[PDB]
């Protein structure tokens with residue numbers, strides 16, 4: 110069939126649309142990181158804020174794991190109840206800001222390594238009511254190995270292929286840990302610039318509902 114996996118799946122997130130200045134800042138930051146990757150013969154991080162023809166692509170804050178409901182109608186009803194419960198909050202908007210240094214997250218099959226920065230403490234705190242609403246409605250049997258919560262809220266800014274994906278797991282983990290050290294020690298000088306400028310106020314959430322993306326106003 111068509112989309113047999115994604116038909117019952119929902120996922121909640123914040124959409125971060127970069128203005129022209131934020132785009133230029135991320136161009137500059139990632140160019141400096143990738144110069145360091147070149148120097149050290151590592152894979153480069155593809156910038157996540159630009160697509161084909163340099164078209165701007167929004168970044169995101171994931172707010173839920175991949176949620177697999179019993180059928181498509183249950184997915185749509187639960188997403189609608191999340192939409193209403195989020196509207197019912199006093200929240201007119203949620204702020205997004207980052208703090209700390211570079212983090213590198215591996216995806217579920219270790220093929221991709223995401224260069225990211227964690228959300229600042231007040232930004233994570235403002236999302237706790239939203240995260241509670243998600244926890245109330247998510248399916249009890251998870252299909253993701255990585256749950257999404259206050260402890261790992263982040264924005265990813267670039268993504269590299271794991272060159273050691275098909276090597277021994279110990280070799281790949283050693284290369285990932287030295288990569289984490291490498292970007293932190295050698296490619297951190299523009300993080301104050303990134304943290305000062307990659308700040309957002311979101312007036313709505315987004316959800317992937319099956320194959321579609323819908324908007325949940327605050």
Ligand SMILES: O=c1ccn([C@@H]2O[C@H](COP(=O)(O)O)[C@@H](O)[C@H]2O)c(=O)[nH]1
Pocket residue numbers: 170171214215216217223225255256261263264265
């Ligand atoms: O604590 C975490 C949180 C997320 N991820 C992974 O980081 C990737 C980037 O997620 P995101 O930036 O799209 O939210 C995803 O593959 C996710 O599974 C982790 O490895 N650990």
